[PDB]
Amino acid sequence: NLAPLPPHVPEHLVFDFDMYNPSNLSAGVQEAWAVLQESNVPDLVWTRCNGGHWIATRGQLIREAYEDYRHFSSECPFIPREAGEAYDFIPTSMDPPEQRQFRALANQVVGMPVVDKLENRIQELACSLIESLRPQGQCNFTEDYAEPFPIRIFMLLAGLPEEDIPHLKYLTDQMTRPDGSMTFAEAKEALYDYLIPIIEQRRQKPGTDAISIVANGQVNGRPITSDEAKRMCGLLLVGGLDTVVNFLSFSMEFLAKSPEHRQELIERPERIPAACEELLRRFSLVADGRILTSDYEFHGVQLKKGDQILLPQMLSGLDERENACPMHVDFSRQKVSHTTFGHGSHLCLGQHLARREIIVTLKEWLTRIPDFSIAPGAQIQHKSGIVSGVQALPLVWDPATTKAV
Ligand code: 6HE
Ligand SMILES: CC1(C)[C@@H]2CC[C@@]1(C)C(=O)C2
Ligand SMILES: [Cl-]
Ligand SMILES: [K+]
């Protein structure tokens, strides 16, 4: 459905891109979004899809708007409007100054010191999952590794039972790639139905898990409220269940299709961290945005208070104006420019955990299964939304070419 064109929007800026089902999707989701960077498309366009909103199509504008929280507010950060209105996670639904005091608590539970506490378990799980698949000569990568690896690390960190994964993963997916059976508000309320009793249990009887730490936390020296704790835990759950999960599949699909790049990392394993960064650029996958706090002329375009603007994190690094030959993967790329983990005051606090999970996966997969390919006659289908992903990734290999560690 196409929403009526607002009176202030000129026809020449209309480009009806659908972020939940882009027309070029069969080419790959990054490719589908990159249609917005064809030479005839303006830096800033209006789509009538998904209730109507602006889209910044170039890194320069995306960065500028993420920096300018005074004009571009995180209050309503998701499209469609009903989702952005319902979205109340902390700290990502707040602007500075209010936002900042909550970042330290989040950092405590998912940041670098916690990555250190989890290091051995991350390593052990990657190795065990991969060794279990190795002799089979095939896997369904999304279900067999991309999901269980990061999700089990998260459930461990959060002290939540693994048998709760199917329910939580379903709900989280309705917030990022809704199947239409639940509004964002309904999925949010269901997630809160889950979290509220657990938060009170852990305020009564604290453990050492992330939910206990948030629920008993202090925010600039005063106690967090039960409600604030719930809103922070919601963000942590969505980050844990729907980010790295999708990214690993883009990366493994690429490696399955590029024997040369696999060989590069096998021969020169020291390049794996740089490879991770270049894959984070090329297979960037997030697109949220902001709401205008006032009428504002931005790059020659009249924006009105209340207008939503999608600021795709994915697009900055794909912009030829930021990286030459942007669709080409070059592990030796000198300046890897991207906003994959966001930009401005809301830079991802989970990024150290994400990079560890990625780097461990690349190392431990290629150690055991250096030679693999896409299953015979398979056509890999992507999916688009707030976080984009891979529907299924069937891989095959000859077990004789593998190595048990
Ligand atoms: C378990 C926690 C976790 C994990 C695994 C991630 N994130 Fe992070 N994240 C990302 C973006 C673009 C933003 C800013 C959003 C905005 O400005 O509105 C955040 C912010 C955040 C913030 C503020 C938090 C607490 C957060 N994200 C937890 C978080 C992207 C990512 C990506 C691309 C990955 C993985 C590849 C990721 N996150 C893993
Ligand atoms: C946009 C995000 C990737 C970032 C972490 C999870 C996510 C869906 C959010 O709600 C904030
Ligand atoms: Cl934040
Ligand atoms: K909101």
Identify the CATH number of the domain in which residue 222 sits.
Answer: 1.10.630.10
- The Cα–Cα gap between 370 and 325 comes to 27
Q: What is the 3-state secondary structure (H, E, C) of the chain?
A: CCCCCCCCCCHHHECCCCCCCCCCHHHCHHHHHHHHHCCCCCCEEEECHHHCEEEECCHHHHHHHHHCCCCEECCCCCCCHHHHHHCCCCCCCCCCCCCHHHHHHHHHHHCHHHHHHHHHHHHHHHHHHHHHHHHHCEEEHHHHHHCHHHHHHHHHHHCCCHHHHHHHHHHHHHHHCCCCCCCHHHHHHHHHHHHHHHHHHHHHCCCCCHHHHHHCCEECCEECCHHHHHHHHHHHHHHHHHCHHHHHHHHHHHHHHCHHHHHHHHHCHHHHHHHHHHHHHHCCCECCEEEECCCEEECCEEECCCCEEECCHHHHHHCCCCCCCCCCCCCCCCCCCCCCCCCHHHCCCCHHHHHHHHHHHHHHHHHHCCCCEECCCCCCCEECCCECEECCCEEECCHHHCCCC
Distance 351 CA to ligand 1 centre (A): 7
β-pairing verdict for 301-303 and 218-219: unpaired
| Residues surrounding ion ligand 3 at CB below 5 Å | 91-92, 346
> Using CA positions, which residue lies closest to atom 10 of ligand 2?
235
The residue among 366, 362, 393, 389 whose CA lies nearest residue 378 is 393
- What distance in Å separates the CA atoms of residue 159 and residue 211, rounded to the nearest whole number? 7
Ligand nearest to the CA of 349: 1
Q: Is 240 a catalytic residue?
A: no
Is 133 labeled as catalytic in the residue annotation? no
CB 44 within 8 A of CB 54: yes
Q: Is position 243 annotated as part of the catalytic site?
A: yes
Resolution rounded to one decimal, in angstroms: 1.5
Q: Reply yes or no on whether 203 is catalytic.
A: no
Strands 53-56 and 308-310 come out as: parallel
Q: Which ligand 1 atom is nearest residue 232's CA?
A: 25
Which is catalytic among the residues 125, 157, 160, 349?
Answer: 349
Among protein residues, the one whose CA lies closest to atom 34 of ligand 1: 243
Contacts of 320 (CB under 8 A, 6+ apart): 37, 326
Please confirm, yes or no, whether 49 is among the known catalytic residues. no
- Residue 82 structure tokens: 């009903």
Report which ligand 2 atom has the smallest distance to the Cα of 288.
1
Query: Hey, what amino acid is at 234?
Result: G
Q: State the total domains in the chain.
A: 1
What is the domain range of residue 282?
1-405
Ligand that lies nearest to the alpha carbon of residue 89, given by its number in the listed order: 2
Sheet containing 53-56: which strands, arranged edge to edge?
A: 44-47, 53-56, 308-310, 289-292, 72-73
Q: Please state the residue numbers annotated as binding site for heme.
A: 348
The one catalytic residue in 48, 134, 177, 281 is: 177
Catalytic: 389? no
Task: Please give the method by which this entry was determined.
Answer: X-ray
- Rounded to whole angstroms, the Cα distance separating 293 from 273 reads 39
The active-site residue out of 289, 350, 385, 389 is 350
Q: Show binding-site residues.
A: 348
Distance between CA atoms of residues 241 and 376, nearest Å: 30
Q: How far apart are CA 223 and CA 296, in angstroms?
A: 38
Kindly identify the ligand whose nearest atom is closest to the C-alpha of 341: 1
- Residues with beta carbon inside 6 Å of ligand 1? 74, 77, 91-92, 106, 110, 154, 235-236, 239-240, 243-244, 247, 286, 288, 313, 340-342, 346, 348-350, 353-354
Pseudo-torsion of CA 173, 275, 127, 382, nearest 10°? 30
Catalytic residue among 157, 191, 348, 395: 348
User: Which amino acid would we find at residue 338?
Assistant: H
Give the Å distance between the CA of 61 and the centre of ligand 4.
Answer: 23
Within 6 Å (CB) of ligand 2, which residues are found?
A: 89, 92, 176, 235, 238-239, 243, 286, 288, 386-387
Joined together, the tokens standing for residue 171 give: 């709900």
The pocket of ion ligand 4, defined by CB under 5 A, consists of 87
Q: How far is the CA of 77 from the centre of ligand 2 (A)?
A: 10
Q: Which two tokens stand for residue 32?
A: 């589908």
